[PDB]
Each structure stands twice: as C-alpha cells, then as structure tokens.
Design a protein around this ligand. Structure first.
Ligand SMILES: COc1cc(-c2cncc3c2CN(C)Cc2cc(N4CCNCC4)ccc2-3)cc(OC)c1OC
Length: 298
C-alpha cells in the first residue's frame, strides 16, 4: 500500500551523519521518512530486517509502516517509513516543557516497557528473538500524544535466541553514540561474544535517559534545566577519550541534585539510575526489574 513514490516530503525535521528524517504526507496523513545516508547503509539493512523479517511491533517501539528503495537524483536512496509523532523526540520535548510526577513516571515506564520488549525473547514457532538496542539515547526516543514514549532506530540492534544459542551482531561499521557509551565499551572489556553484554549497555544508556527526564520533573517549585548526560565534563560531540576520562578514569556519574532528596519519587528514581550505572556490568538491573520497580514507584 504505502510506497515511497506516493509520499510527499513536506519538511525536514532532522539531519545528520545518519542521513535525514522528513515529515511526509501519504494519502493526507502525516508520516515520518528517514532517508539513510550513504555511509549508514548497513543500518538501513539491519533495521529493515527487524521490522520486516522479525516483524517487530510494540506500542513503545516506533511504529513501522514500510521499507522502500527509491531512485532519485541518479542515486538509489534507502527509505524507512514509520508513524509520525508531532511532539518530536524526548530530547526536543524535554527542552520545551517540564513534567509533573505522573507525566515523568509515564515517560520512563513507557521506555522501560519498550526496552523490556526488545530484551525479552518470545519462544516457539515464529517467536521473536531477544534484541539489544545498543544506541539508546533521548534523540532516539519519541513522545506520543498520550504522554507515552517509543524507542526508535534499530540500525545497531543485535539478536539472540536461547534454543539455538546463536548471537547475531551483524557487521555494521556504525559505532554507538559516544556520550552514552558504557564503561565496558570505553575500555574494551565488554564480552562481545556474550549477548548479556549488549543488554547491559542498554541498561547503562537507559539510566542516563532516566537522569535526563527526572531533572525535568518539578518538586516543591524546583526543576533543573534540560542538560545532556555529562554536560559539565565533556564538550559538544565528545571524543572517545573524552568519555573514557570521565566515565572510566574518574569514575564519574551524572550528579543527583540535592532537591531530589526532598521528593519521594525523585529519590526512588535516583536510586534506580545508580543501579543502572555500576562499573561492573553484571551488577546492573535488568530491563524487567526496572519496569517492575517503575511500576511500583509513586
Ligand atoms: C530518531 O529516529 C527516528 C525518528 C523519527 C521521527 C518520528 N516522529 C517525529 C520526529 C521524528 C524525527 N526526530 C528527528 C524527532 C523529531 C523532531 C521534530 N522537530 C520539530 C522542529 N524543530 C526540531 C524538532 C519533528 C519530528 C520528529 C523517524 C524515524 O524513521 C522514519 C527515525 O528513525 C528510526
């Protein structure tokens, strides 16, 4: 039904090394079109495999519509068409508004539910495998109209099945975002032949996103400005060694504002992120435990 040639590219909502994301019109309705850059072709392939072959579908994962190739300007462009969320990314959303207690917990529980869906394998005939994301950040999370979020960008995902015990890391030249890089990645101790290692990298990045969101929830008339993780120690577009010095050498973690300790929700959230930030990867919580704890927090 939905084909690239029938979509009208209205305006560019994002550009970068990955390529571009456009707001498009298809049959009147709004759609999101990611035109992958030439350098990021392998990410389009892996994402197409997950959405089409694995048929990944969850309410807290960016709703896939159609994959497509289009020949334009004497070149073949790789397209990904998904649902369009007019609120933009959580990165944009956090800078535009503050959150109450319910809106903040709704955001982080929806992300945990999405991550738990990826990590947990459904067994049996045609059962979906376990998936690790490996590039979780606030720019890769979109805010829906009901206050919930969905996880986006599967170009780096790795897959694992328990029965066969096969790990599928693909061969993508893409590296994760350096700002959200887990310490075992920065010092090259991560066991690349073990699937659990990739889940624990997501948990680290999740903890960073949890910090970004909770800063924006107001308690007792106090709220922090939006800031990216490690905003105070690394520069814009931080280097691999910049992050190594902060996260590995100095063992630093995002600061917990003192005002958080006079609010029961932010205090429980602060404990939650620190349990996502252990230098020892095997000590961090699982996505399911995070989802359960976030379900119980008031
Ligand atoms: C981050 O991964 C993707 C995301 C989207 C997507 C979905 N729904 C809304 C937006 C986006 C794109 N991203 C850049 C956030 C965003 C931002 C804005 N803006 C308003 C104007 N000022 C700047 C911010 C508008 C729309 C979106 C689409 C994708 O595939 C088609 C993605 O790939 C897997």
């Amino acid at each position: 039904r939905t084909v690239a040639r029938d979509i009208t590219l209205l305006e560019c909502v994002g550009k970068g090394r990955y390529g571009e994301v456009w707001r498009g019109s298809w049959q009147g309705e709004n759609v999101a079109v990611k035109i992958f850059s030439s350098r990021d072709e392998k990410s389009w392939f892996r994402e197409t495999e997950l959405y089409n072959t694995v048929m990944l579908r969850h309410e807290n994962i960016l709703g896939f519509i159609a994959s497509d190739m289009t020949s334009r300007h004497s070149s073949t462009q790789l397209w990904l068409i998904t649902h369009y969320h007019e609120m933009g990314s959580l990165y944009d959303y956090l800078q535009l508004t503050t959150l109450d207690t319910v809106s903040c917990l709704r955001i982080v529980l929806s992300i945990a539910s999405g991550l738990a869906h990826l990590h947990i394998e459904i067994f049996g005939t045609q059962g979906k495998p376990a998936i690790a994301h490996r590039d979780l950040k606030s720019k890769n999370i979109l805010v829906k109209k009901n206050g919930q979020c969905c996880i986006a960008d599967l170009g780096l995902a790795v897959m694992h099945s328990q029965s066969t015990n096969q790990l599928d890391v693909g061969n993508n030249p893409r590296v994760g975002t350096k700002r959200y890089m887990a310490p075992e990645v920065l010092d090259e101790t991560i066991q690349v032949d073990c699937f659990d290692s990739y889940k624990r990298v997501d948990i680290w990045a999740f903890g960073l996103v949890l910090w970004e969101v909770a800063r924006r929830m107001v308690s007792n008339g106090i709220v922090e400005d939006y800031k990216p993780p490690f905003y105070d120690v690394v520069p814009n577009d931080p280097s691999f060694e910049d992050m190594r010095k902060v996260v590995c050498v100095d063992q630093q973690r995002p600061n917990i504002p003192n005002r958080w300790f006079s609010d029961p929700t932010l205090t429980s959230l602060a404990k939650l992120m620190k349990e996502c930030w252990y230098q020892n990867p095997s000590a961090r919580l699982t996505a399911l435990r995070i989802k359960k704890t976030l379900t119980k927090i008031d």
